[PDB]
Amino acid sequence: MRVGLVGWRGMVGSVLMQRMVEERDFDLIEPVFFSTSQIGVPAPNFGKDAGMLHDAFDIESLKQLDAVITCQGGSYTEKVYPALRQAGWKGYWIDAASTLRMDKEAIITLDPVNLKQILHGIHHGTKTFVGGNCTVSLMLMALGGLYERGLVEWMSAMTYQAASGAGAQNMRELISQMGVINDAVSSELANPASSILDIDKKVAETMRSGSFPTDNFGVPLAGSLIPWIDVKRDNGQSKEEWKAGVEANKILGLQDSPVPIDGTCVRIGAMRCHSQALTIKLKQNIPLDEIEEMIATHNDWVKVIPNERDITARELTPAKVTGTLSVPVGRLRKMAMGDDFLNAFTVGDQLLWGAAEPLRRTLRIILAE
Amino acid sequence: MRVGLVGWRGMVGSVLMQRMVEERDFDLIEPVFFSTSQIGVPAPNFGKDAGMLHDAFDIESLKQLDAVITCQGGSYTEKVYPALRQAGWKGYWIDAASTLRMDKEAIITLDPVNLKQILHGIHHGTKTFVGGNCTVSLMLMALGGLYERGLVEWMSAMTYQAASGAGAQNMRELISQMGVINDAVSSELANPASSILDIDKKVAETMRSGSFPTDNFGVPLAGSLIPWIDVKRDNGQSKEEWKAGVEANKILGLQDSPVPIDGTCVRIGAMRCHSQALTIKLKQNIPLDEIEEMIATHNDWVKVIPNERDITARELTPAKVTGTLSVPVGRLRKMAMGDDFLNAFTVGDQLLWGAAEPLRRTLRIILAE
């Protein structure tokens, strides 16, 4: 199989390349590397020679491929995808971008949750497979066991989203902001006799100053939070908030009778893990033990953490999860509202299950069929 | 009125002192400053001479006071309060600590919500007045207009709690951790062409290292979060999560038919403002405009932030709110679950309405009555 790679040098693409090397995906394909900047020079060698860099915008070149995996983003997909399909290309388009998620000819791919749907699509002529929104994918990796059994009546999701969701430049800005905050008080910070209110005064002033680095976020992130992600929609949701309901229900094949999913999506000062605090309304009163089993046995990556302070502090955090494929879920308990209300808190890596991992897995599924 | 001040040198105490100076509270009282480790040293001069620092554990000296305002904490109250009351002291005990909050003889004070309850207490022999949990006070300052009208069926609260809530050393530690994170990658950040994954790897290693300053939190906070605050309770709640239900219903005088309040309390890398993401179940489908009016008209400090992207990012954040008495609430909209589900996101300063402000206001109410 001849597989084109686009956006392999960017953040998501570089994670994908790392994972494809780790899993020896390249052993099974003929990789063709494309560039949006410079062509004709040697392609990256991740273990074997792959020839030259090809023109990412050349329709004839793309037409010769059996598949494309693109992490290049929405602008690229919009520019290339329609023309490529119009030109008669029937190969597999595997895409990280949101562009095609809700297209009638596309399947959103999260195989631990919807392998059956993916396989049906492959067998019946679906050629476009799109990774879902990071928060959606991470939530379903945590709660797939409940959703697959049709037990969720509705879910409120309040999120704690990392800088990586916005981009590499945003991550850099977050760290720079952290440095500027510390710089303001570093001389007196470690002196317990120094006025804590004077320290706070300087921190607040620094964060409010015009020179505080906020080009990417627009406002401070370090030391703060931003309770709005992406553009406004007419009903008052942000696009980030709206994505959950439409995408999860497409993944789950419930568009005719969707699970209402809503809440507030908040950016916080984390690098690359999204966390989510969930109010889950269940259709029945299920014992907590059974809920724990349903969740834990759904997939190999979900990890149900005992509901205890010390273990939670150590295991259920971005510090623990960053750069791993593990999806811990904890604080699992019935709520004051009733035995059909379930609290959950989950953490997941935005770049792995939330971006790169479903792309390589989809490739492997297509190969095996 | 002779008023004793205990724990005035600490963080909440320092904020209280600043506020009492700003509002000229000292003009109305005879302040007597107490101490644990500086007995005999001249008392602070905030405008007038207050003599010398008295012994905070001497019951005989405390008995000469008409009132005590204590920011000293739970262990101090546990030791001094029973002994002082048993000695026959009939003065006013105004306390920030959680200790006496649920005692039958005590009133939880948040006068923009329960002035009437406080006044009735004063006129009927109540001599113990206790500030509520920071999260409870801040939530009710935002949503008092709905709660006082009995329109809330239940509420799920997912919190984003500032470092200051854990203590002054914890806030310092947060800033310290920010510095350590930046230090690890400062060279790479200054280079435009550095790899984001290399930067990410170093940040994660730094956060996980024994050298990372985690003495107070036990785990990283900067770059992370901690979805557990305070001790575990038998039903799986943390103490922090349990406080909202018992305290809010006491404040509102709803013990006979309490509003269910529950959720997950999470520590994040914010300086001194708590933020809360609320799923509010209403007993009726109230028009959104009317909800906003009910919220806005409740008190002088709540601020309805229009549900627009740019204004939300600028106004509904710790960076905006820090060190002010403003309690913005925004993202006000009906949710996917139905028009009797209200989303709300609110931010409030932990040290003001969440700690010091109800104490000085209670003093002023007692003085005026």
XYZ file of C-alpha atoms in Angstrom:
738
model
C 0.000 0.000 0.000
C 1.316 3.408 -1.062
C 0.581 5.917 1.703
C 1.153 9.668 1.428
C 2.074 11.599 4.576
C 1.258 15.314 4.898
C 2.015 17.523 7.920
C 4.372 14.871 9.325
C 6.796 17.567 10.529
C 4.257 19.524 12.623
C 3.418 18.797 16.253
C 0.651 16.199 15.724
C 2.508 14.747 12.727
C 5.729 14.347 14.736
C 3.849 12.443 17.444
C 2.351 10.274 14.686
C 5.802 9.628 13.159
C 7.163 8.640 16.591
C 4.250 6.224 17.116
C 4.501 4.712 13.612
C 8.206 4.005 14.237
C 7.433 2.535 17.687
C 4.755 0.222 16.268
C 6.742 -0.570 13.085
C 3.877 0.696 10.874
C 6.357 1.614 8.108
C 7.233 -2.088 7.636
C 3.746 -2.580 6.154
C 3.519 0.376 3.748
C 5.326 2.314 1.042
C 5.474 5.769 2.665
C 5.522 8.800 0.366
C 6.412 12.040 2.149
C 4.853 15.314 0.985
C 5.857 18.904 1.727
C 4.048 22.235 1.646
C 7.332 24.157 1.655
C 10.101 22.451 -0.351
C 10.247 19.457 -2.722
C 12.691 17.131 -4.516
C 15.098 16.817 -1.564
C 15.440 13.556 0.432
C 12.423 12.457 2.471
C 12.949 11.629 6.154
C 14.513 8.224 6.846
C 12.726 6.714 9.864
C 14.335 3.293 9.298
C 14.345 2.870 5.518
C 14.827 5.124 2.487
C 11.628 6.821 1.282
C 12.892 8.750 -1.774
C 12.163 12.463 -2.214
C 9.733 15.012 -0.784
C 6.716 15.399 -3.091
C 4.436 18.384 -3.758
C 1.529 18.251 -1.252
C -0.674 20.222 -3.681
C -0.031 18.185 -6.829
C -3.287 16.396 -7.741
C -1.632 13.936 -10.154
C 0.898 12.884 -7.482
C -1.797 12.462 -4.821
C -3.913 10.443 -7.304
C -1.189 7.761 -7.427
C -1.631 7.021 -3.705
C -3.688 4.262 -2.093
C -4.024 6.433 1.020
C -3.202 9.807 2.570
C -2.596 10.448 6.254
C -2.701 14.201 6.816
C -1.928 16.142 9.997
C -1.507 19.374 7.994
C -4.790 20.920 9.168
C -8.113 22.283 7.927
C -6.794 24.835 5.423
C -4.900 22.091 3.578
C -7.880 19.698 3.535
C -10.204 22.443 2.208
C -7.701 23.286 -0.538
C -6.883 19.748 -1.707
C -9.615 17.258 -0.726
C -12.524 18.478 -2.910
C -10.338 18.685 -6.049
C -8.809 15.278 -5.336
C -12.222 13.549 -5.048
C -13.548 15.501 -8.066
C -10.549 14.240 -10.070
C -11.720 10.662 -9.408
C -9.451 9.560 -6.549
C -10.927 6.646 -4.620
C -8.129 6.159 -2.067
C -8.333 6.439 1.715
C -8.195 9.921 3.246
C -7.166 9.738 6.898
C -7.340 13.182 8.494
C -6.666 14.830 11.875
C -8.531 18.026 10.863
C -12.133 18.871 11.803
C -13.046 19.832 8.201
C -14.648 16.547 7.107
C -15.900 15.119 10.440
C -19.586 15.840 9.801
C -19.431 15.060 6.078
C -21.945 12.396 4.994
C -19.141 10.465 3.261
C -16.828 10.454 6.296
C -16.597 8.243 9.381
C -15.145 9.644 12.622
C -12.603 7.051 13.771
C -12.084 5.930 17.385
C -11.815 2.171 16.972
C -11.828 1.066 20.645
C -15.323 2.608 20.644
C -16.534 2.201 17.039
C -14.498 -0.560 15.317
C -17.750 -2.136 14.050
C -18.808 1.132 12.371
C -15.329 1.596 10.840
C -15.289 -1.963 9.430
C -18.812 -1.602 8.004
C -17.662 1.592 6.298
C -14.534 -0.027 4.835
C -16.650 -2.907 3.452
C -19.320 -0.653 1.993
C -17.216 1.945 0.223
C -16.429 4.638 2.808
C -13.044 6.168 1.910
C -12.768 9.108 4.320
C -11.847 8.570 7.960
C -11.411 11.469 10.343
C -10.039 11.607 13.885
C -12.475 13.266 16.296
C -12.155 16.305 18.574
C -9.506 15.691 21.274
C -11.907 16.141 24.250
C -14.548 13.895 22.603
C -12.083 11.074 21.901
C -10.601 11.257 25.413
C -14.047 11.260 27.034
C -15.170 8.205 25.029
C -11.904 6.354 25.779
C -12.780 6.864 29.449
C -16.545 6.231 29.309
C -17.028 3.913 26.297
C -18.249 1.098 28.566
C -21.271 3.169 29.649
C -22.046 4.707 26.251
C -21.897 1.391 24.357
C -24.531 -0.061 26.717
C -26.907 2.868 26.065
C -26.904 3.762 29.759
C -26.218 7.508 29.468
C -29.294 9.762 29.546
C -27.235 12.970 29.368
C -23.823 14.281 30.360
C -22.566 17.679 31.505
C -18.841 18.121 30.796
C -16.713 20.838 32.394
C -13.242 20.688 30.863
C -9.679 21.621 31.796
C -7.968 21.824 28.411
C -4.230 21.979 27.710
C -2.339 24.498 25.560
C -1.446 21.810 22.969
C -5.046 21.840 21.698
C -4.385 25.373 20.447
C -0.941 24.628 18.968
C 2.822 24.482 19.540
C 3.145 28.284 19.658
C 0.483 28.365 22.380
C 2.429 25.813 24.461
C 5.566 27.933 24.118
C 3.599 31.038 25.152
C 2.259 29.228 28.234
C 5.803 28.382 29.405
C 7.012 31.926 28.590
C 4.133 33.372 30.648
C 5.163 31.104 33.560
C 8.706 32.476 33.318
C 7.546 36.110 33.268
C 5.361 35.544 36.368
C 8.277 34.014 38.303
C 10.733 36.688 37.078
C 8.563 39.389 38.678
C 9.013 38.065 42.224
C 11.933 35.592 42.080
C 14.188 37.829 44.212
C 11.811 37.725 47.202
C 9.699 34.591 46.566
C 11.802 32.222 48.727
C 11.970 34.681 51.655
C 9.130 33.766 54.068
C 9.435 37.190 55.750
C 8.605 39.015 52.499
C 5.022 40.262 52.172
C 2.819 37.676 50.421
C 0.457 40.493 49.373
C 3.367 42.418 47.837
C 4.282 39.227 45.921
C 0.687 38.878 44.714
C 0.550 42.599 43.838
C 3.575 42.203 41.536
C 2.243 38.983 39.974
C -1.150 40.587 39.216
C 0.528 43.710 37.797
C 2.895 41.655 35.637
C 0.027 39.565 34.254
C -1.996 42.723 33.441
C 0.940 44.570 31.834
C 1.015 45.161 28.079
C 4.400 43.435 27.892
C 2.994 40.153 29.255
C 3.295 37.698 26.338
C -0.285 37.104 25.135
C -0.002 37.188 21.317
C -1.410 33.663 20.903
C -3.942 33.399 23.736
C -4.953 37.095 23.725
C -5.059 37.082 27.540
C -2.963 35.437 30.276
C -3.195 31.658 30.647
C -0.531 30.891 33.257
C -1.915 31.904 36.667
C -5.403 32.110 35.164
C -7.849 30.303 32.853
C -9.954 31.068 29.762
C -13.590 29.826 29.808
C -14.021 30.079 26.025
C -12.483 27.958 23.296
C -13.079 28.600 19.561
C -15.804 30.632 17.804
C -19.271 31.437 19.132
C -22.288 29.553 17.811
C -25.811 31.012 17.644
C -27.200 29.074 20.637
C -24.509 30.447 22.968
C -22.178 27.445 22.844
C -18.593 27.802 21.732
C -17.685 25.566 18.778
C -15.558 23.466 21.171
C -18.598 22.816 23.385
C -20.820 21.996 20.387
C -18.338 19.498 18.922
C -18.848 16.992 21.761
C -22.552 16.360 21.118
C -22.414 16.131 17.328
C -19.191 14.079 17.106
C -19.791 11.614 19.972
C -23.259 10.856 18.639
C -21.883 10.302 15.123
C -19.169 7.983 16.514
C -21.794 6.090 18.524
C -24.301 5.985 15.633
C -27.026 7.730 17.647
C -27.786 10.748 15.422
C -31.486 9.789 15.250
C -31.717 9.804 19.070
C -28.618 11.612 20.420
C -27.294 11.729 23.983
C -27.370 15.393 25.053
C -23.798 16.425 25.892
C -22.993 20.005 26.923
C -20.941 22.105 29.336
C -18.172 24.699 29.453
C -14.811 24.169 27.770
C -12.035 25.952 29.681
C -8.371 26.418 28.734
C -5.980 25.935 31.678
C -2.192 26.091 32.048
C -1.397 22.452 31.200
C 0.971 21.371 28.394
C -0.717 18.490 26.562
C -3.283 16.688 28.738
C -7.006 17.425 28.748
C -8.955 16.796 31.931
C -12.740 16.602 32.279
C -15.134 16.751 35.218
C -18.341 14.952 34.321
C -21.896 14.825 35.642
C -23.295 11.662 34.077
C -27.020 11.001 34.262
C -27.739 7.291 33.919
C -31.003 5.774 32.665
C -31.028 3.264 35.549
C -29.719 2.849 39.094
C -26.661 0.650 38.499
C -24.469 -0.470 41.435
C -21.138 1.400 41.554
C -19.209 -1.923 41.324
C -20.925 -2.785 38.049
C -20.286 0.726 36.663
C -16.594 0.321 37.573
C -16.424 -3.027 35.743
C -18.278 -1.668 32.686
C -15.850 1.250 32.432
C -12.637 -0.662 33.203
C -13.241 -3.601 30.842
C -14.125 -1.508 27.766
C -10.579 -1.067 26.485
C -6.883 -1.656 27.248
C -6.075 2.000 28.069
C -8.772 3.237 30.417
C -7.571 2.947 34.030
C -10.042 3.200 36.908
C -8.357 4.820 39.908
C -9.497 3.990 43.488
C -11.498 6.851 45.002
C -8.840 7.853 47.537
C -6.976 11.128 48.106
C -3.301 10.110 47.859
C -3.674 7.759 44.861
C -5.886 10.315 43.069
C -3.282 13.066 43.609
C -0.588 10.777 42.168
C -2.465 9.078 39.292
C -5.313 11.306 38.098
C -3.345 14.301 36.800
C -1.650 15.684 33.658
C 1.709 15.269 35.459
C 1.101 11.495 35.534
C -0.553 11.103 32.126
C 1.548 13.366 29.848
C 3.138 11.516 26.930
C 1.387 8.206 27.727
C -1.505 6.250 26.168
C -3.176 5.765 29.571
C -6.642 7.242 30.181
C -7.272 7.275 33.948
C -10.760 7.907 35.285
C -11.477 8.421 38.980
C -13.639 10.105 41.605
C -16.282 7.623 40.401
C -19.223 7.859 42.790
C -22.971 8.467 42.988
C -23.913 12.103 43.557
C -26.147 13.934 46.057
C -28.775 14.326 43.305
C -29.464 10.573 43.311
C -28.200 7.079 42.558
C -28.674 7.739 38.818
C -26.165 10.620 38.910
C -22.535 9.597 38.441
C -19.534 11.840 39.016
C -16.359 11.142 37.032
C -13.029 12.882 36.551
C -10.735 11.827 33.699
C -7.357 12.856 32.237
C -5.954 12.031 28.788
C -3.056 12.999 26.541
C -4.305 15.379 23.825
C -1.624 14.428 21.294
C -2.016 10.644 21.494
C -5.629 9.398 21.774
C -6.768 12.970 21.167
C -4.905 13.351 17.854
C -2.296 10.957 16.427
C -3.266 7.510 17.743
C -6.608 7.026 15.945
C -4.904 7.928 12.634
C -2.254 5.180 12.772
C -4.794 2.661 14.120
C -7.165 3.429 11.213
C -4.294 2.797 8.778
C -3.640 -0.579 10.441
C -7.336 -1.518 10.301
C -7.520 -0.648 6.584
C -4.340 -2.691 5.948
C -5.745 -5.752 7.758
C -8.944 -5.654 5.649
C -15.984 48.071 71.479
C -12.746 46.247 72.310
C -11.976 43.891 69.422
C -9.219 41.274 69.538
C -7.417 40.366 66.316
C -5.945 36.865 65.994
C -4.004 35.557 62.982
C -3.728 39.098 61.592
C -0.168 38.519 60.399
C -1.106 35.579 58.125
C -2.375 35.779 54.544
C -6.142 36.011 55.197
C -5.253 38.210 58.179
C -3.163 40.550 56.007
C -6.045 40.935 53.537
C -8.402 41.619 56.463
C -5.988 44.258 57.816
C -5.760 45.938 54.386
C -9.552 45.988 54.040
C -10.098 47.330 57.569
C -7.631 50.167 56.823
C -9.246 50.906 53.426
C -12.742 51.089 54.952
C -11.533 52.872 58.122
C -12.912 50.106 60.373
C -10.246 50.877 62.993
C -11.839 54.320 63.549
C -14.874 52.565 65.061
C -13.174 50.085 67.415
C -10.408 49.732 69.979
C -8.119 47.148 68.339
C -6.213 44.686 70.526
C -3.631 42.685 68.594
C -2.853 39.141 69.718
C 0.146 36.923 68.985
C 1.552 33.403 69.354
C 5.287 34.064 68.926
C 5.681 37.851 69.352
C 4.035 38.534 72.735
C 5.224 41.846 74.224
C 6.465 43.304 70.923
C 4.761 46.593 69.881
C 1.471 46.025 68.030
C 1.174 47.099 64.368
C 0.343 50.756 63.730
C -2.244 51.014 60.942
C -3.089 54.636 61.800
C -3.227 54.799 65.595
C -1.174 53.274 68.427
C -2.618 49.937 69.583
C -0.148 49.241 72.414
C 1.595 45.864 72.661
C 0.965 42.357 71.286
C -1.078 40.275 73.751
C -1.098 36.519 74.401
C -3.488 34.720 72.011
C -3.824 31.714 74.352
C -4.415 33.605 77.617
C -8.143 33.216 78.342
C -8.075 36.012 80.950
C -6.856 38.598 78.421
C -9.375 37.465 75.777
C -12.190 37.714 78.358
C -11.680 41.517 78.502
C -12.707 41.834 74.834
C -16.174 42.578 73.461
C -15.294 40.744 70.233
C -12.683 38.489 68.617
C -11.937 38.331 64.895
C -9.761 35.290 64.221
C -8.063 34.260 60.972
C -5.740 31.933 62.923
C -7.389 28.669 61.800
C -9.128 25.483 62.937
C -6.655 24.236 65.554
C -6.653 27.616 67.331
C -10.464 27.730 67.527
C -10.666 24.110 68.785
C -8.330 24.957 71.686
C -9.368 28.501 72.666
C -13.110 28.782 71.886
C -14.446 26.058 74.250
C -12.198 27.233 77.115
C -13.181 30.878 76.512
C -16.934 30.125 76.427
C -16.605 27.894 79.505
C -14.932 30.830 81.291
C -18.204 32.780 80.925
C -17.295 35.001 77.963
C -20.340 36.431 76.222
C -18.546 38.381 73.482
C -18.770 38.025 69.703
C -16.618 35.326 68.101
C -16.054 36.126 64.434
C -14.157 33.303 62.740
C -12.816 32.361 59.302
C -12.249 28.707 60.301
C -14.497 25.746 59.414
C -14.606 24.518 63.042
C -17.832 26.123 64.302
C -19.659 26.460 60.973
C -22.149 23.620 61.587
C -22.667 24.287 65.308
C -26.271 25.028 66.343
C -25.184 28.145 68.279
C -23.336 29.624 65.278
C -24.491 31.486 62.171
C -22.611 31.253 58.871
C -22.226 34.868 57.743
C -22.664 36.019 54.142
C -24.778 39.140 54.567
C -25.571 39.964 50.917
C -27.425 36.632 51.077
C -28.446 36.217 54.740
C -28.427 39.676 56.404
C -31.894 38.924 57.837
C -30.675 35.666 59.424
C -27.655 37.484 60.915
C -29.744 40.356 62.329
C -32.226 37.922 63.906
C -29.305 36.076 65.463
C -27.812 39.288 66.895
C -31.168 40.332 68.394
C -31.767 36.880 69.869
C -28.478 36.125 71.608
C -26.270 34.610 68.888
C -22.622 35.437 69.633
C -20.783 33.198 67.152
C -20.509 34.172 63.487
C -18.484 32.135 61.022
C -17.392 32.815 57.441
C -18.389 30.025 55.044
C -16.124 27.960 52.791
C -14.524 30.133 50.086
C -16.241 28.190 47.252
C -19.675 28.357 48.950
C -19.473 32.111 49.576
C -18.294 32.818 46.019
C -20.971 30.601 44.459
C -23.759 32.273 46.457
C -22.446 35.764 45.668
C -22.879 34.782 42.010
C -26.155 32.844 42.204
C -27.949 34.369 45.216
C -30.693 35.760 42.955
C -31.730 32.225 41.960
C -31.245 30.490 45.326
C -33.157 33.109 47.354
C -36.129 32.680 44.997
C -36.027 28.903 45.582
C -35.589 28.221 41.867
C -32.734 25.707 42.074
C -33.709 22.023 42.001
C -30.071 20.916 42.206
C -26.615 22.013 41.173
C -23.474 20.218 40.029
C -20.314 22.270 40.605
C -16.944 21.560 38.993
C -14.367 23.894 40.520
C -11.030 25.385 39.462
C -9.550 26.365 42.819
C -6.600 28.719 43.290
C -3.356 27.924 45.120
C -4.051 30.641 47.731
C -6.883 28.439 49.037
C -4.303 25.957 50.326
C -2.194 28.688 51.962
C 0.443 31.371 51.376
C 3.299 28.863 51.066
C 1.215 26.974 48.488
C 0.799 30.115 46.369
C 4.571 30.722 46.613
C 5.140 27.085 45.614
C 2.974 27.498 42.514
C 5.070 30.475 41.369
C 8.261 28.561 42.236
C 7.141 25.608 40.099
C 6.391 27.980 37.203
C 9.964 29.292 37.406
C 11.458 25.791 37.476
C 9.409 24.777 34.417
C 10.552 27.825 32.433
C 14.207 27.454 33.584
C 14.349 23.937 32.131
C 13.551 25.083 28.580
C 14.416 28.813 28.537
C 17.263 28.308 26.027
C 14.993 26.304 23.710
C 12.174 28.870 23.935
C 14.598 31.636 22.867
C 15.369 29.586 19.725
C 12.499 29.902 17.176
C 13.546 26.643 15.449
C 13.574 24.338 18.525
C 11.379 21.200 18.581
C 8.159 21.488 20.601
C 8.361 17.768 21.462
C 11.890 18.263 22.859
C 10.598 21.181 24.959
C 7.612 19.087 26.073
C 9.832 16.134 27.052
C 12.059 18.380 29.214
C 9.077 20.069 30.912
C 7.549 16.671 31.796
C 10.873 15.341 33.150
C 11.354 18.533 35.175
C 7.866 18.279 36.707
C 8.456 14.620 37.620
C 11.934 15.192 39.095
C 12.824 15.056 42.802
C 14.180 18.591 42.389
C 10.729 19.953 41.479
C 9.483 21.954 44.481
C 6.431 20.017 45.707
C 6.837 20.223 49.515
C 3.424 21.832 50.085
C 1.232 20.265 47.368
C 2.984 16.866 47.369
C 2.698 16.726 43.562
C 3.116 19.287 40.729
C 0.503 22.025 40.376
C 2.055 24.236 37.694
C 1.445 22.451 34.387
C -1.019 20.113 36.099
C -4.019 19.954 38.450
C -5.150 17.997 41.517
C -8.731 16.648 41.520
C -8.878 16.237 45.322
C -9.142 18.898 48.009
C -9.260 18.107 51.783
C -9.908 14.777 53.573
C -11.937 11.833 52.230
C -15.447 11.187 53.557
C -17.212 7.801 53.682
C -19.533 8.416 50.708
C -16.598 9.153 48.388
C -16.809 12.942 48.545
C -13.870 15.016 49.682
C -14.622 17.363 52.598
C -14.407 20.321 50.170
C -17.162 18.843 47.973
C -19.347 18.101 50.999
C -19.082 21.633 52.446
C -21.195 23.229 49.691
C -24.335 21.213 50.486
C -24.270 21.612 54.267
C -23.085 25.239 54.369
C -25.171 26.724 51.537
C -28.360 25.165 52.898
C -27.555 26.483 56.383
C -26.919 30.002 54.996
C -30.201 29.860 53.057
C -32.131 28.350 56.003
C -33.117 25.312 53.930
C -32.161 22.490 56.340
C -35.697 21.033 56.219
C -35.643 20.763 52.401
C -32.019 21.095 51.223
C -30.914 21.764 47.655
C -28.668 18.908 46.487
C -25.239 20.360 45.622
C -22.353 18.120 44.542
C -19.402 17.939 42.163
C -15.629 17.630 41.999
C -13.343 20.232 43.578
C -10.081 20.613 41.649
C -6.926 22.572 42.514
C -5.475 24.386 39.494
C -2.536 26.727 38.864
C -4.440 29.958 39.518
C -3.094 32.499 42.007
C -5.949 33.634 44.292
C -9.300 33.382 42.467
C -11.625 30.386 42.454
C -13.619 29.609 39.354
C -16.673 27.360 39.169
C -18.432 25.674 36.241
C -22.022 25.025 37.218
C -24.814 22.858 35.874
C -27.884 24.433 37.458
C -31.161 22.540 37.270
C -34.041 24.990 37.501
C -37.507 24.180 38.838
C -39.023 26.165 35.952
C -38.143 27.226 32.398
C -37.397 30.875 33.233
C -36.614 33.121 30.218
C -32.841 33.739 29.973
C -33.196 37.550 30.143
C -35.113 37.218 33.415
C -32.480 34.834 34.831
C -29.798 37.443 34.057
C -31.897 40.124 35.777
C -32.492 37.899 38.850
C -28.741 37.293 39.064
C -27.656 40.923 38.446
C -30.090 42.536 40.918
C -29.141 40.316 43.878
C -26.151 42.284 45.160
C -23.751 45.136 44.346
C -20.784 42.900 43.427
C -22.096 40.197 41.116
C -21.528 41.037 37.436
C -23.367 39.396 34.534
C -20.817 39.007 31.734
C -22.421 38.917 28.251
C -22.080 35.562 26.521
C -19.651 36.748 23.844
C -16.175 35.401 23.135
C -13.910 38.437 23.460
C -15.662 39.954 26.492
C -15.651 36.535 28.263
C -11.891 36.067 27.720
C -11.233 39.600 29.021
C -13.577 39.635 32.029
C -14.389 36.111 33.262
C -10.926 35.090 34.491
C -8.728 35.080 37.604
C -6.357 37.546 35.874
C -9.207 40.077 35.673
C -10.834 39.390 39.048
C -7.760 39.054 41.294
C -7.680 41.484 44.233
C -11.131 42.922 43.470
C -14.531 42.499 45.137
C -16.211 41.762 41.777
C -17.994 38.422 41.262
C -18.490 37.965 37.504
C -20.773 35.207 36.240
C -20.990 34.409 32.531
C -21.552 31.760 29.866
C -25.187 32.001 31.013
C -27.247 29.890 28.619
C -29.696 26.998 28.518
C -28.009 23.654 27.936
C -28.542 20.808 25.455
C -30.340 18.770 28.161
C -33.195 21.280 28.203
C -34.380 24.803 28.916
C -34.516 24.005 32.641
C -30.747 23.351 32.603
C -28.663 26.498 33.081
C -24.908 26.649 32.440
C -22.961 29.194 34.507
C -19.268 29.967 34.872
C -18.216 32.233 37.725
C -14.946 33.652 39.101
C -14.325 35.204 42.527
C -11.382 36.299 44.660
C -10.692 33.635 47.312
C -9.249 36.038 49.893
C -11.963 38.730 49.752
C -15.563 37.409 49.571
C -14.136 33.942 50.118
C -12.421 34.847 53.412
C -11.733 38.346 54.808
C -14.733 40.360 53.603
C -17.549 38.551 55.447
C -15.542 38.975 58.680
C -15.163 42.766 58.545
C -18.756 43.130 57.284
C -20.059 41.068 60.228
C -18.093 43.317 62.605
C -19.731 46.378 61.008
C -23.220 44.829 61.280
C -22.704 44.025 64.994
C -21.406 47.579 65.606
C -24.435 49.161 63.900
C -26.911 47.022 65.875
